[PDB]
Design an enzyme around this catalytic site. Structure first.
Site, PDB file in Angstrom:
ATOM      1  N   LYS A 233      -1.274  -2.558 -10.005  1.00  0.00           N
ATOM      2  CA  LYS A 233      -1.231  -1.265  -9.350  1.00  0.00           C
ATOM      3  C   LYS A 233      -2.625  -0.642  -9.447  1.00  0.00           C
ATOM      4  O   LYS A 233      -3.122  -0.393 -10.546  1.00  0.00           O
ATOM      5  CB  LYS A 233      -0.165  -0.383 -10.013  1.00  0.00           C
ATOM      6  CG  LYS A 233       0.013   0.984  -9.380  1.00  0.00           C
ATOM      7  CD  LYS A 233       1.106   1.793 -10.065  1.00  0.00           C
ATOM      8  CE  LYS A 233       1.167   3.196  -9.482  1.00  0.00           C
ATOM      9  NZ  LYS A 233       2.227   4.039 -10.097  1.00  0.00           N
TER      10      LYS A 233
ATOM     11  N   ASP B 243      13.826   7.320 -11.560  1.00  0.00           N
ATOM     12  CA  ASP B 243      13.573   6.792 -10.216  1.00  0.00           C
ATOM     13  C   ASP B 243      14.302   5.468 -10.014  1.00  0.00           C
ATOM     14  O   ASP B 243      13.740   4.517  -9.473  1.00  0.00           O
ATOM     15  CB  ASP B 243      12.052   6.652  -9.945  1.00  0.00           C
ATOM     16  CG  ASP B 243      11.717   6.569  -8.448  1.00  0.00           C
ATOM     17  OD1 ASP B 243      12.589   6.847  -7.590  1.00  0.00           O
ATOM     18  OD2 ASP B 243      10.571   6.208  -8.120  1.00  0.00           O
TER      19      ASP B 243
ATOM     20  N   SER C   4       0.827  -1.202   0.000  1.00  0.00           N
ATOM     21  CA  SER C   4       0.000   0.000   0.000  1.00  0.00           C
ATOM     22  C   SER C   4       0.866   1.258   0.000  1.00  0.00           C
ATOM     23  O   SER C   4       1.977   1.263   0.531  1.00  0.00           O
ATOM     24  CB  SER C   4      -0.929  -0.006   1.218  1.00  0.00           C
ATOM     25  OG  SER C   4      -1.821   1.089   1.190  1.00  0.00           O
TER      26      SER C   4
ATOM     27  N   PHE D 164      -0.527   6.545  -3.693  1.00  0.00           N
ATOM     28  CA  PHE D 164      -1.232   6.277  -4.980  1.00  0.00           C
ATOM     29  C   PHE D 164      -2.427   5.348  -4.782  1.00  0.00           C
ATOM     30  O   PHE D 164      -3.474   5.531  -5.409  1.00  0.00           O
ATOM     31  CB  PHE D 164      -0.267   5.694  -6.030  1.00  0.00           C
ATOM     32  CG  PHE D 164       0.251   4.316  -5.692  1.00  0.00           C
ATOM     33  CD1 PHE D 164       1.376   4.158  -4.886  1.00  0.00           C
ATOM     34  CD2 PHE D 164      -0.386   3.175  -6.185  1.00  0.00           C
ATOM     35  CE1 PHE D 164       1.854   2.887  -4.567  1.00  0.00           C
ATOM     36  CE2 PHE D 164       0.087   1.899  -5.869  1.00  0.00           C
ATOM     37  CZ  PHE D 164       1.208   1.758  -5.061  1.00  0.00           C
TER      38      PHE D 164
HETATM   39  C1  LIG Z   1       4.179  -4.617  -3.346  1.00  0.00           C
HETATM   40  C2  LIG Z   1       5.636  -4.953  -3.001  1.00  0.00           C
HETATM   41  C3  LIG Z   1       6.123  -4.109  -1.798  1.00  0.00           C
HETATM   42  C4  LIG Z   1       6.007  -5.050  -0.581  1.00  0.00           C
HETATM   43  C5  LIG Z   1       6.254  -6.452  -1.170  1.00  0.00           C
HETATM   44  N1  LIG Z   1       5.745  -6.373  -2.569  1.00  0.00           N
HETATM   45  C6  LIG Z   1       5.885  -7.411  -3.502  1.00  0.00           C
HETATM   46  C7  LIG Z   1       6.090  -8.726  -3.071  1.00  0.00           C
HETATM   47  C8  LIG Z   1       6.219  -9.738  -4.017  1.00  0.00           C
HETATM   48  C9  LIG Z   1       6.142  -9.409  -5.368  1.00  0.00           C
HETATM   49  C10 LIG Z   1       5.936  -8.077  -5.740  1.00  0.00           C
HETATM   50  N2  LIG Z   1       5.867  -7.780  -7.100  1.00  0.00           N
HETATM   51  C11 LIG Z   1       5.569  -6.552  -7.721  1.00  0.00           C
HETATM   52  C12 LIG Z   1       5.305  -5.364  -7.075  1.00  0.00           C
HETATM   53  C13 LIG Z   1       5.038  -4.185  -7.824  1.00  0.00           C
HETATM   54  C14 LIG Z   1       4.778  -2.859  -7.193  1.00  0.00           C
HETATM   55  C15 LIG Z   1       3.908  -1.939  -7.805  1.00  0.00           C
HETATM   56  C16 LIG Z   1       3.693  -0.693  -7.235  1.00  0.00           C
HETATM   57  C17 LIG Z   1       4.355  -0.355  -6.061  1.00  0.00           C
HETATM   58  C18 LIG Z   1       5.229  -1.250  -5.457  1.00  0.00           C
HETATM   59  C19 LIG Z   1       5.455  -2.497  -6.023  1.00  0.00           C
HETATM   60  N3  LIG Z   1       5.025  -4.214  -9.141  1.00  0.00           N
HETATM   61  N4  LIG Z   1       5.286  -5.392  -9.826  1.00  0.00           N
HETATM   62  C20 LIG Z   1       5.367  -5.674 -11.152  1.00  0.00           C
HETATM   63  C21 LIG Z   1       5.687  -6.986 -11.240  1.00  0.00           C
HETATM   64  N5  LIG Z   1       5.799  -7.503 -10.015  1.00  0.00           N
HETATM   65  C22 LIG Z   1       5.567  -6.548  -9.133  1.00  0.00           C
HETATM   66  N6  LIG Z   1       5.819  -7.142  -4.805  1.00  0.00           N
END
Ligand SMILES: C[C@H]1CCCN1c1cccc(Nc2cc(-c3ccccc3)nn3ccnc23)n1
EC number: 2.7.10.2
Length: 266
Positions: A38, A125, A17, A18
């Site tokens: 997202k 970024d 957790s 925009f």
């Molecule tokens: C969500 C994040 C943070 C905490 C742990 N967490 C985890 C855990 C396992 C897999 C992922 N994968 C992905 C996260 C985000 C994303 C998109 C937007 C913001 C942040 C991350 N984009 N994305 C595109 C492809 N795969 C992912 N995130």
């Protein structure tokens, strides 16, 4: 680009957790594809569309693939899932990852950035939190929310900012180039070799600027090879014109990675 909502199934639990990030599945021609979604809470909508517009144009093994966008309850950006998540969090929880393995992953980021430079996009970024792991040996670049397609006649884009990742010309002149991304890449390297520790710990942006202006740079992480620290410092060349581009950075990493691999077998 516009996905069918009835082919998308979201999980109840939140990944992060925009707005929110959720895990889901998108029904393909025959197979089902695991996705990260997202999900947004006028400015935010336009930011998401522009982001999608960037990702749609990018085609590379070391960049996250966008499946598409979906407009339902909220605006949704649907991406190929990278299961192991952000690089910094992963290295924080996996402190025994080997030095060779770190070199492999940062080299993969440089290959992705080499492509992005050649494509004339600036990332803006580029940080360890924005590198996502498909496996322990496979990294991809994500988060193109600040990214810009450069004008045909200019090698830079003129603009909260991630100040600790920004080159001096970004701070002083608001000019962002592929060379500016190279600077961020040095900070990312530092983060990776520090197992996801935050750069410039305990410092304000203004103090970071003051430090760099004095010619000071962050120290060599514990167990980080001199050759990799040398590359970091080269990425942190103050003058943009004298800073290496990603073609030179990727070559340095590629060659060094191949050397270490030969050490391992021997
Ligand atoms: C969500 C994040 C943070 C905490 C742990 N967490 C985890 C855990 C396992 C897999 C992922 N994968 C992905 C996260 C985000 C994303 C998109 C937007 C913001 C942040 C991350 N984009 N994305 C595109 C492809 N795969 C992912 N995130």
């Amino acid at each position: 680009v516009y996905l069918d909502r009835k082919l998308l199934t979201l999980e109840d639990k939140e990944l992060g957790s925009f707005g929110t990030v959720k895990k889901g599945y998108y029904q393909m021609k025959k197979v089902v594809k695991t996705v990260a979604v997202k999900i947004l809470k006028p400015a935010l909508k336009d930011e998401l569309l522009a982001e999608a517009n960037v990702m749609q144009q990018l085609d590379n093994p070391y960049i996250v693939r966008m499946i598409g966008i979906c407009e339902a309850e909220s605006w949704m950006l649907v991406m190929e899932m990278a299961e192991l998540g952000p690089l910094n969090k992963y290295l924080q929880q996996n402190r025994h990852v080997k030095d060779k393995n770190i070199i492999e992953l940062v080299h993969q980021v440089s290959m992705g950035m080499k492509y992005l430079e050649e494509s004339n996009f600036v990332h803006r970024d580029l940080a360890a939190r924005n590198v996502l792991l498909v496996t322990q040996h496979y990294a991809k670049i994500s988060d193109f929310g600040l990214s810009k397609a450069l004008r045909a006649d200019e090698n830079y884009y003129k603009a909260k900012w991630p100040v600790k990742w920004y080159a001096p010309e970004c701070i002083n002149y608001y000019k962002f180039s592929s060379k500016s991304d190279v600077w961020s890449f040095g900070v990312l390297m530092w983060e990776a070799f520090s197992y996801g520790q935050k750069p410039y710990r305990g410092m304000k942006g203004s103090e970071v600027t003051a430090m760099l202006e004095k010619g000071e740079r962050m120290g060599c992480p514990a167990g980080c090879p001199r050759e990799m620290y040398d590359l970091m410092n080269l990425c942190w060349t103050y003058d943009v014109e004298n800073r290496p581009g990603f073609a030179a950075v990727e070559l340095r990493l590629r060659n060094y990675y191949y050397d270490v691999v030969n050490e391992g077998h021997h």
